[model samples]
Target: LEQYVKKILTSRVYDVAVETPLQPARQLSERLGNQVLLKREDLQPVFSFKIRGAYNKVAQLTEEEKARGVIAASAGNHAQGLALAAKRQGIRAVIVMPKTTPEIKVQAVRAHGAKAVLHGDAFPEALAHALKLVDEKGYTFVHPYDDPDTIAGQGTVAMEILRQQPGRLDAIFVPVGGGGLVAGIAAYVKYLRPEIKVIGVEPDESNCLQAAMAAGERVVLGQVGLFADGVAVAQIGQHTFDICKDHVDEVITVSTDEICAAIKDIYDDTRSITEPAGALAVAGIKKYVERERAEGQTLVAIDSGANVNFDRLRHVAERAELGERREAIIAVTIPERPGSFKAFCEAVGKRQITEFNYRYHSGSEAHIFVGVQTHPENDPREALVAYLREKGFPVLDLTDNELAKLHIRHMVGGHAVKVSDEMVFRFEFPERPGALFNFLTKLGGRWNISMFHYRNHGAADGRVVAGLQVPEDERHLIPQTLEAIGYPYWDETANPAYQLFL
Candidate 1:
């Protein structure tokens, strides 16, 4: 570990790598109750800190090896980093990318003049193929984060961070993948500023470093969440774990929502977006401060990259509020009557209605899927639930339900036919705060709602698939009743399709 420091200092990374600024995040600092600094590695030429390691490794190749060319298989960043590095030095590089890779990335490696080969749909198959070519073609293989040259290259980031912030440093938070970046930073920081803590952060689902730290040896994750694609390695690199297992002070694992919120924090403070993996450091820092309640201490987080697709921002924006305690997703049960919808809104009292959905199914009570916004320090989330409970609205907080967020707000859209005379109808009524409630209430309590569905709408009209278990055969009686309700409805008689679901 000590020896890596010398190599990091002597490494020839300036050829293609820039010394990214160690900038302070004033907003995050104030909000987190600690001094926060960001090492902006995302601003590198390839838009990631991967270039330093890739370039350094490529530069070390022997002339004979360079003539034979370099090869690597990747899920994403390493391929492009190595492509640009080899391209800069006029060496042939072939990257075997998974067929599952996004198109923008495949084009990026090719944009650097590297041979981008599409192979199997995932890393294991692509890597096995890359190794096969190494044996057959005798190509010089560049191990993205496992090799000594790569580790030395990444250590330059710490070297830059230390030079930029020379006073009152308490801790350095690094995002981990194959553990290369953390290992490199840990080795350099520990050797020089031994008292400054070196901490590693990984997405909870893809946390090979944390898993290894607990096992006394490196272990493979059974599965990794691909949301944070950059740090989605199954196992820590052999060389990286050797230094990290001892040199690192601690490891932190953050959730997907936590990563999204960190991205928002960066954007709010800097107006920049980051890859989920890159935001892991900031997420880790936030978690640390919340856990320890540390104040006034100076801490640094590595913003490792900004290579995510623009389309992914929608997901980040939606999940960010939840992680920051700015949004509450809950299920509320209320009386299925005319004044109930209006009552619930009056009960909420706040103007910030983010989402709302409800369905009246086979009972006097109705279930609602609604989203409400909250303030971090002022209201938080629990305050809203407490308020609802106090107002007689029994609510279930689905803010942390993975599946509910993934699928609910849009239910499966159907139900069952338990009643002998189950009648289903689609009603298009003018959308008001409690429009469905008025229509249903005026239609009267002569029938019980057996199936229903609804969602928040922007159009002038709202829709509800209303089902009723009427007394005897009321097909003729309800047509007269519903026509007077003053809404256009499509009546589908007994055993209709909406009643098929559980």
Candidate 2:
């Protein structure tokens, strides 16, 4: 610990990595009843703390070692950081990146003048290829998180946090990948202020540190969730585990949904986007506060990185509400009748409906998957469920069901498993509080509905894809029937896209 402390104090990170500010999260603090602090390491030059370790390791390499160049296999920020560091030191750098890596990240290494060796689709394959290159070609291998110098470099973050927030510090939450950041932080914080807790945060599915700490030895995970790509390591680094297994205070694991909520929380305060792995510290802090029922203590979470792809934000946004318990997803049983739809809407009375998906199968009861607005403090999920049940609505809570949210939401009613006489239509109706209930009522009585998918949002018109069961005799009545309903409609039964997707 003392050796690591000295290394951290003498780290050459300032040459490449800047000291990010320790900013207060006002809204989060008020909500959690704690002084929430964010160590904005995402502000680093490489948009992450990895540059510190990458540069520190490269700087310390012997002249002979430097002559051989450096190599590393990385799917994300580590590659960019090391490439930039090597460019500064005038040493050749080669990064083996999985083909699955986002194009932006691949280009980042090239922009740094490093050779990006795009390899296999999976991370493990790229890693193996890098190892083969190191052995066969004699390039110096820079372990992303296993090297002592790298750990010392990351430890510099803790150094800055302690200096910036000198007093009243209770806990510092660090995100754990292969454990470099947490190990670096634990060594420095424990050596200086033994009372301040240094907790490690990890995605529950890829919790190598938590698992290793519990098992007392490193063990490979059978599988790891790929959502939080930053901290998606299957095993803890040996060097990092040696430090964290003892010096670290504890480890906390959070779900993908909780991480999404933390991303939203961070954005609400900082107006910044964070990669799933980057938000682990904030997510962990929230869980810790809730579990311990902590109040008023100063809690610091390392806002580690912000390299997420823009396209993936849609998934993050959808899951964030559920993570904070601000939306409830439920399967409701409503009678397959015209007024029944109206009655269900009346039962749900004016609450903001985020989503609604219903498909008519052969039964008197229709299953509607619905997402309703909620507030953890004011409109709690429990209260909403109780209210629905009291109104005689049979509800099956699917808020926490992983499969339902990730898959069923988009795939509720697909190409009818051979349901004959189904005609699909797209309808546009007025966008209002009770418009969905009113629009569906027009055709609900005369038609046996096959599929319906709609989401309530701000627009002049609300759109829905509806499938109706029309016998051969009533096929010609469809156009006249919709004309009577008086909404702009399109008969998409023969639309190739609809046929393939129905």
Candidate 3:
């Protein structure tokens, strides 16, 4: 059966494209104390390994079946494979994809001469819609992972790996989405050479197979994260899970942040980009080798695909550094008065500012989001951050992030009013140095200050928030300050606790 699948894979149904290089990673090898070889599956012409299954499945169709054509639902690797294979076979192919599928992927399917249909939000929706198309059109459904023939076809990678290396491999780590590639490879490797350890790497967010194994049966995930878009499968393939449970040595799940980090690391090391799913195996291997201290282990990790969006690379790089703890984010409240911005900036020292957003929607206080770089040995819990917090400037940290930078950072500022008491002590002063110290000195330690919140949100010429405690008896003297200085102030003391916290 395996040999038959091998024949289908090697047969000339579609182009042979390129056999990816299984190169050693000098950096990773030294770190793991192992002979680390990364099988560059991402370098495949279609940027993935799915074509082997698609082409092999297409080749086996009877003439009558071929006449009826083929159909599948995958806005990802399988879609590209089936589309390209159908075009090569001169057969009609229909694909159903989620409406949110990337434009590039949709265009790729069209470029391969397949009819692309947009429907559903994810794989299940698209899969359901495709099943209807397959039934109505009487087209063969080239299932992504369930079919035995597809699994066999994908196993050809194992053959190629063995042929290229031709020696003992301590272990091979394959990323598992629906488990097609790993299922195929594990089956082939175990049968052909039982000594090699096979580890299936999966995204923790979409650990469908792990859940299935735990339940002692197939299980579907309730919620799947699409950060690792290619592996956002909600359920394990029935046949693949069966093979995996029996033959695969272990299954390890990794976080999306770690996967992103690995993607960047792989790109930096080889200048070869890989999608999140493509980098999973490398990430898993790095993890396992580190945890187990698998010194002298002959390790191989499959690089699944380089079909990733260029814009997403910025996010990947950011998250990668975050995983390494090289970046930090903080939210701070400063007196909502003039010149506070300059004073805060001066205190920040040599740190570079990446983002600064502030909004004054709340009647009580101001809100600001700031992104900055920390010195190499800077204390994470320094007095400056605390000082700003104590000065009615609360800060939230969103540093070490790809998502924060890409989506959340762009949506900062714009506060809303919350109900609070009439403790709204608003005062204004000059926007110059020592302005803050002078005001604090004037407070004279008389009244107990309750709440304070301010933001130095970037605005034209600058504005700040200063919250102060004023005794009811001192209300008459409050107006004396605005007359002396040169600014305005507001006081809110009747708002709810929630509003005051904001």
Candidate 4:
């Protein structure tokens, strides 16, 4: 492993313009009780570790091959890497990406002087189309992973880490996509410092290595959640799989929420936002260290990329607390009487109320939405369950029922209340003191609020979770109302699909 890593170090492919910073995170270290260091690969020009493999792959090409040029498929980071590398080398490059790929990334590739061809729907779909283009145009296909040379080139990052810190590294947390980054790093670190634990962090939505390792072969995911676009590969690379299977000490999966929380943690300390895939390593490391209660161990996390779309950052910020179990929602069945609702509210005490929803059944039973502040001091679900039971209210806990709590905000009154027609919509508002005033001012005309839930989670912008009653006759009023409010919104009430959960 060291020999191959050394060979990679000797190669002329590696560039130094985006020299990564190895920074220590004090807050995260204190929280996880470990000496945590972050390898800031998120600081790259393309905002990722992808440049290493792209540069190395291009560098290995002979003079004749360089003249022939190269082609690769990527939605964002990888395309930026290859485009920039090819531009620097005075080589013609063609990039293939999904039509849905962000215009920012596509323009970035073109900004690097590469021809960008839009195609397909996802990464693999784009890759397939690119392969056909490669065959037709006679361009060398620069595979994202799946090749020995590219893997060796990526190993250079580990070499830099070992050289920079000449001490015992208890563990290194690496983000896993097609497994190239971890496979390469493991090759170098294990052979040189066999005692140091190497762990791979993957989005739970695409834990290809975890499933493959268990099955003793590569396994392709049928569908991967696209939230972590940078590390959402459906299939593991052949070269990467072989190396990771043999050398990686532990392969762990972090949920999309974990990545979001980790991104928030990084921002709290560094005031820097990382893409979901970039935060995976740090998030996974934090979980592993805390779970093991492994204090005093020196740890390193690869902060992989910062190529996040600013628009999407709003969503990330909204879900960050929920992702880390720092915020949760549950339904507490208070007595269906008037004073009982207020008593339940008082029972909640000073705990922050993130959301409160209500619906009266038969003008008798008061079913109010009770949202509480999360307590890091205790398990949130357990705390809510005990508190409600002790208060003598039958509660149907929905913290673990993700879809019910997150998406379906409708008030349910089991067999008693008649099924009334309803409407659901997505709404966004400014995140400020007078935002609610603006919502009410615009919505004051005719609509009545049947059920609603809103969480002000300190997100820079705001979005409200609400369901409004649409009179059977007033269905025609939607367009006029939307025009009246003049804010961003989407209706979900008309779909037969939306009725499935109800």
Q: Compare the candidates by TM-score and give the number of the best one.
A: 2
TM-score of 4: 0.75
Please provide, for model 2 over 69-104, each residue's C-alpha lDDT reduced to its tens digit, 9 standing for 90 to 100.
Answer: 999999788998899999999999999988877788
Worst 10 residues of 3 by lDDT: 453-462
C-alpha root-mean-square deviation, each candidate: 5.4, 4.0, 8.9, 6.8
Q: Candidates sorted by TM-score, descending order?
A: 2, 1, 4, 3
List model 3 lDDT by residue over 1-502, tens digit each.
3554455355543364356688888887886688888898777668898887788788778998898889999888889888878887899999999999889999999998898999988667988988997778888999888877778777878878887888869889998888888888887788778799989888989888778777888888888887888888888998888788888888889998889878876876798999999999888988898789788878899998877789988778766766555445666665644444445544554444445455444335445566654545664535556655666556766664557756766665322343322244555555343344454455434443333333222223223344344556776766665445545655444455435454
Minimal lDDT window, size 10, model 4: 409-418
Higher TM-score: candidate 2 or 4?
2
Off by over 4 Å in 2: 220-223, 323-350, 358-370, 375-423, 428-432, 435-451, 457-461, 467-489, 496-502
Global lDDT of model 1: 0.83
Model 2 reaches what TM-score against the true structure?
0.83
Off by over 4 Å in 1: 1-3, 211-215, 221-223, 323-325, 328-350, 359-368, 376-408, 412-502
Highest-lDDT candidate: 2
Q: How do the predictions measure up, each by TM-score?
A: 0.77, 0.83, 0.71, 0.75
Judge candidate 4 against the unseen true structure and give its global Cα lDDT, from 0 to 1: 0.77
Candidate 3 Cα misplacement greater than 4 A, ranges? 1-14, 330-351, 356-370, 375-502
